[PDB]
Amino acid sequence: SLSSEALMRRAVSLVTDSTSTFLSQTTYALIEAITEYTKAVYTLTSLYRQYTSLLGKMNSEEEDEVWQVIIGARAEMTSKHQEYLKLETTWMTAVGLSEMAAEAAYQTGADQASITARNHIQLVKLQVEEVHQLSRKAETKLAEAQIEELRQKTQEEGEERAESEQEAYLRED
Amino acid sequence: SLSSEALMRRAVSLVTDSTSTFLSQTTYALIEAITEYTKAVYTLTSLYRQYTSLLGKMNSEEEDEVWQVIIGARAEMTSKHQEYLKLETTWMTAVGLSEMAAEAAYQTGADQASITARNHIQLVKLQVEEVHQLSRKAETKLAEAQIEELRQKTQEEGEERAESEQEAYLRED
Numbered sequence: 001s002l003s004s005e006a007l008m009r010r011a012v013s014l015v016t017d018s019t020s021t022f023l024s025q026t027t028y029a030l031i032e033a034i035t036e037y038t039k040a041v042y043t044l045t046s047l048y049r050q051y052t053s054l055l056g057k058m059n060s061e062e063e064d065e066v067w068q069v070i071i072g073a074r075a076e077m078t079s080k081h082q083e084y085l086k087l088e089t090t091w092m093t094a095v096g097l098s099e100m101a102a103e104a105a106y107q108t109g110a111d112q113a114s115i116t117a118r119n120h121i122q123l124v125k126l127q128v129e130e131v132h133q134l135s136r137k138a139e140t141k142l143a144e145a146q147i148e149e150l151r152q153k154t155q156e157e158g159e160e161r162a163e164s165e166q167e168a169y170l171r172e173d
Numbered sequence: 174s175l176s177s178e179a180l181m182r183r184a185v186s187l188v189t190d191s192t193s194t195f196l197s198q199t200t201y202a203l204i205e206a207i208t209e210y211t212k213a214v215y216t217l218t219s220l221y222r223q224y225t226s227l228l229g230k231m232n233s234e235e236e237d238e239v240w241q242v243i244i245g246a247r248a249e250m251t252s253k254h255q256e257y258l259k260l261e262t263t264w265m266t267a268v269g270l271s272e273m274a275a276e277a278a279y280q281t282g283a284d285q286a287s288i289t290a291r292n293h294i295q296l297v298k299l300q301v302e303e304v305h306q307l308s309r310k311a312e313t314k315l316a317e318a319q320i321e322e323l324r325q326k327t328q329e330e331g332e333e334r335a336e337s338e339q340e341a342y343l344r345e346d
Contacts, residue, residue: 018192022181086280093273
């Protein structure tokens with residue numbers, strides 16, 4: 001049936017282009033929320049630098065208010081992280097749909113659509129892995145700011161502890 | 174982002190309805206192929222019944238020609254069997270697509286789309302298995318016709334062979 005196979009191939013092109021537009025919106029929402037995460041990560045990094053500058057006993061109206069804002073930032077970042085992961089779960093469903101559509105296109109013989117799908121899938125996956133590289137960069141720089149905050153905080157902590165032992169030794173002993 | 178997720182939900186609704194279009198197209202192509210297969214099946218069935226009526230020497234100058242026609246019938250039926258099985262593989266591919274789309278619609282909260290798709294799949298799968306039930310009836314009746322053809326051939330030619338042995342024993346022995 002010439003018409004039947006011709007139209008069915010074309011319909012699989014509809015599945016491919018619908019799933020492509022969907023996957024594009026999904027990539028865009030994913031990139032958007034990845035971007036918001038990246039922003040929040042870099043923000044938290046700067047906030048770690050700020051809070052680290054406030055280490056040692058000083059104005060809580062600075063130190064612990066910066067900590068409170070850090071709590072707000074953490075909640076924002078984490079909720080957005082969970083939301084981009086919700087999107088990314090749907091995104092893996094979308095990629096899976098596009099791949100299954102490309103296989104339907106092959107099985108029907110819309111190999112031009114199968115190829116265009118596979119290309120679109122790869123372009124999306126590449127762009128996603130690239131913004132994932134940005135994510136890993138941001139997360140590494142946040143981890144570095146955590147490590148600096150650890151170095152400073154712990155340093156001060158141990159110093160104070162030593163002094164506290166020396167001050168406890170002042171009496172009755 | 175409620176706007177983002179709502180546009181996403183409509184996008185997935187588009188994937189779900191365009192995949193429902195492809196699934197409909199593939200179901201119609203499948204139903205067509207099933208129908209033409211079932212036609213060739215009932216054809217070969219009746220042809221076997223006719224040929225069974227031609228068993229023995231009664232009209233070899235006809236039995237051999239109905240046999241020749243049966244060869245073409247077998248070829249057409251079997252190539253259509255293989256074809257509609259390729260098509261049904263593609264249909265199960267389309268069902269898998271619509272199922273992954275209904276699941277993405279659920280994961281996206283396009284519940285109206287998800288449920289519409291799920292019941293569309295149920296309708297399609299039932300209608301397919303309805304034509305498949307007709308096909309399985311036809312396959313049962315083809316099997317029955319072949320079985321009775323073999324019964325009739327093995328009986329009539331077995332008794333004629335016994336008579337041929339008895340007639341060969343009449344001479345020189």
